[PDB]
């Protein structure tokens, strides 16, 4: 009874979760309409947390896929994952709604589809014996995932008050603003809701995805459909200490609690090294334990856009370093001995810090039971560089006199412009103030 | 050969970095926790140059001795008070005796002090890197005759050790392995290995542990502290420091001449190279 | 040996075995093994109860509460989780090689109880004074877990019990350093000290 | 922890390091990305020190290659060593700027590529344990390699005031003036940086290269195009105390420290004996080490233009004799015993001089692991004969009229020509003053 309903919502957010669900069948090694293997209980030692708790003798996904675009739910059946999803909770065969592109359009459409959105996730969290929480797999990009998603962070936060809240935030591309210009308004609107009706975030910059897609994959030009590959991997990578053995704080409310020093200091930088084609053929011949988990303490894999002078003028407070598959686990403390001799990572000395290392035995699948994958879940205090990026683009646009009565056409009829500047400046001083 | 004679010289190189955490003593922590955190980083110092892994560097262990280097307050050192201790264990101790361990601590300790001279002389070469932490390449406010007395210093040390390195390595490695092995019937090795060890320290320097050659290596060390402390930071005090060095080298020349007998220690032949140098000007 | 003792928590099992596996694992050996269970049974209840006070929670008491729970959970996690994690994975490995190797059923029992007294000593030194320091660490999350279910001046009672166990681990640090200086358990508890260092 | 960044710069500087890296794979006898022999770990007991160890099945050079013509580094692309170098980490594949041939082009192009030029050698070090220094493998020939490389002789000894500077300067052919006609200008400007913005230097004359190529390697056809073949051999010879262990002077700053008496004297004459072909028809019966150091105390290998009555009117002050590999190491001290009886050594007519002998092993590689090898890294006071050659070809150009205005087309617009002349006669004279 550690059941999570993931709320894949938004146009880009459904796609990062689509290929997330196609990965879990591949590592439990089952045909997606049954358990057809015995590796289902021996290899993966959990049978529920992203599955419905049995009463039929089957394991159905605990998934909701809500969008206002039917293009995402019609792309279910262009693949054989339309006999894994069932049409009454996980989708609704044809569902319309607004274009919508404006945040304040979808935010009031949350308030009249209030009956179905709070009775669609409770007609599937009515087999659970105590809910772990809701992970809002929703995009910050577009006005569909962002409009409805800033609403649900308020209402699952007043009827489920001890529930774990956690988002997979994915931003809109910031280096194209020749096709969009509403981009600093709709982004910062969600971020205000993230620093007081939410507890944890995961911040994923899109230009810092595409940094890696040209530095590890080597495509001619990154575009939506080549961006679902880096995001979907880090999702199935975060539940490799919740589905596979650990021992202590291997529940989801153990790891995620220890990466939050305090509300408004929870912005987690993510790194994921294995996408390259000549580092994928170095694990067949085994690479050393003394270099595959010190490379998760080397900053060159970050999915947050920052400077390289702020990774040395700022220090880690909570860092998680997940090695997968091969590990050789009797030199994992030898690897931890050597952090002090190279000094690649710097650590707080004003107060306690934690370098959490974990290893887990995964189920059979050649990309992960023979291949070393390293997932980083940092908490580094140069996240204020993103908050400068969104405030410096917000104030520049309101002086060109745009979105001051052209964003107020739906549900906004009050002043709230300096309310968004002041809360961002609160966050940027209270992080920096928490560590000397 | 690799960890006492330093033919894996990458270890003695890593030692130079550990010796860059020293610069004399005391000023370093004194705890019973001081060997506990220091025996680890020395075993790791072979990996610190990225060579091998611990499983042929666990034959070597270190026992840190405590001695007063504040000269009544205890503060320990890694010049002559850091000692390699070879293991006694069931596979090799047909070669291992406690007498032969006494001289493993002596060779490892004899190398380490002369190496701290050579290292700290190159701390001076980083000081004076030019554009413009050098200040001055010649007179006035002196560099010309300063550096003239500096170069005849680093002549003498680099060419003394050079002669000492060649009697240390070549006959000892031919004497040992080949001979012992070839003579086959192997029994009671530790009476032969110690005779080997007794020829090996004859080749090192020996000095009969009493003779003014031992007084000149003590005394040229006492000026070497005045050379690093003045250059890190007095020009009349510079030139006095090497006038005492010139006293000590001219004292050495008269000692070579009363050691000259007809053939008497392999250092003697190599010393008469330098004697005929002295004759040439 | 006295650490692990009957309180409100004294949880074990009694493993059902029969001949000829009953002399592979002596019940007297199971009493020797269930106290090493018990040492890890307390520190996961410590560690899980600092999660359960974190999820039960600016204003006056609220802002101070995030700093005492953040500092208290890293105290519990750097001594307990790390020392156990460098324990459990090598100990599985040194037992699979004593498992296969045996031509008798009193050989694998002797190779298990000469394993078992090493595991006690390096994880817990014999003296009642490590008891004293575990409970004070535990009493500050005990002042916490009721105060998140009760609804200032509550913080300074928590801070006085925070300073009580801080003085005592420093006294514990001196008890680490007056040990053998020769046997690898001092090397184990030094690595405890470096995890609390960063 | 003695990681050195080679800064290969210029038209020739890229070529002498192109054949340096190529020399290491062939002397360790392995693939430049594989292992096909066990001599790689057994011969070379510190496989990474100018490389880094495998994690992708490929060797990683610690090299940068910038130049003002993009043609020379595309002549590194053409060659099949693109699985020993990286054309996005190890070089900028097409880097332009000047025509060029002016010294003043590249000196002003390091100061508008000032931000990028120290984030490519400090991004080239990023897993390093600790830096030894920089070797500026740059060219004096042309104004391109000389132009930007002379700016880095200053900024690398005060942004890193404790790291090593030492240059492989290679001059353009002094039997031409039709290759580069700005040659007396670009030489002397760098020679001002060689005496006071340096530490130690290696100056290599080009006409003494072709003196040896027809007398020890006996090719009929003396040309300017044997410039890189004799150089790449002495480059790989100089670092057999860092890529294979030493004992005393077990660092490279060990050898180089004892060959510098004063600033302005440190110009080392390099000699390397194994070029003889009559020592190779007598390698079955093992050639002798008793007459191979009568080539380091008598001319037979100088790549420095020096006179024949300047090996007697000047003496050795410091002389280092590096024996390498198989050599019969038990009579090399017997060989140094018979030097003093003949008097082949030369010592100053006042105080101390020193004939240093040291030894070091090498990996399997028959011309210096089956034959006696002699490297001389000399320090002779006869180095003013070249400084008179460069000064006498410099003032000769000013009575021809050229580069008194054709140098001031970019950057230089103030007079400082008799300022480079005046400092040079100060150099040539204090050296003669320093001895009786």
Author numbering:
A (entry chain m), D (entry chain l): 2 to 437
B (entry chain L): 1400 to 1632, 1648 to 1695
C (entry chain M): 605 to 661, 671 to 764, 821 to 867
What's written in the study?
The γ-tubulin ring complex (γ-TuRC) acts as a structural template for microtubule formation at centrosomes, associating with two main compartments: the pericentriolar material and the centriole lumen. The γ-TuRC has a helical shape consisting of 14 spokes, each containing a copy of γ-tubulin presented by the C-terminal gamma ring protein 2 (GRIP2) domain of one of five paralogous γ-tubulin complex proteins (GCPs). The GCP proteins interact via their N-terminal GRIP1 domains in a specific order: the γ-TuRC core harbors four pairs of GCP2/GCP3 (spoke 1–8), followed by a sequence of vertebrate-specific paralogs GCP4/GCP5/GCP4/GCP6 (spoke 9-12) and finally another pair of GCP2/GCP3 (spoke 13-14). The inside of the γ-TuRC is lined by a lumenal bridge composed of one actin molecule, as well as two α-helical modules formed by the microprotein MZT1 (mitotic-spindle organizing protein 1) and the N-terminal extensions of GCP3 and GCP6 (N-GCP3 and N-GCP6), respectively.
To further support our assignment of NEDD1 and to gain high-resolution insights into the interaction of NEDD1 with the vertebrate γ-TuRC, we used X. laevis egg extract to purify γ-TuRCs for cryo-EM SPA analysis. We subjected the purified X. laevis γ-TuRCs to cryo-EM SPA and identified a subset of particles with stoichiometric NEDD1/N-GCP3/MZT1 grapnel density. Local resolution ranged from 3.9 Å in the core of the complex to 5-8 Å for the NEDD1 segment, where the resolution was initially limited by the plasticity of the NEDD1 segment with respect to the γ-TuRC core. Next, we performed molecular dynamics flexible fitting (MDFF)31 of the AlphaFold2 model into the consensus cryo-EM density, resulting only in minor changes. Cross-correlation analysis against atomic models for N-GCP5/MZT1 and N-GCP3/MZT1 modules indicated that the density segment on spoke 14 corresponds to the single N-GCP5/MZT1 module in the complex. Overall, this indicates that the NEDD1 tetramer interacts with the remaining four available N-GCP3/MZT1 modules. The NEDD1 grapnel interacts with the asymmetric side of the γ-TuRC through docking of the two proximal N-GCP3/MZT1 modules (p1, p2) to GCP5- and GCP6-specific extensions just N-terminal to the GRIP1 domains at spokes 10-12, respectively. Consistent with AlphaFold2 predictions of the interface, a helix-turn-loop structure specific to GCP5 inserts the conserved GCP5 residue Leu252 into a hydrophobic pocket formed by the N-GCP3/MZT1 module p2, which is supported by basic residues interacting with aromatic and acidic residues on GCP5. Similarly, a GCP6-specific helix extends onto the surface of the N-GCP3/MZT1 module p1, where the hydrophobic triad Leu333, Ile335 and Leu336 of GCP6 binds to hydrophobic patches on the N-GCP3/MZT1 module, as also supported by AlphaFold2 predictions. Moreover, the conformation of the γ-TuRC was not affected by the presence or absence of NEDD1, suggesting that NEDD1 binding does not activate the γ-TuRC for MT nucleation.
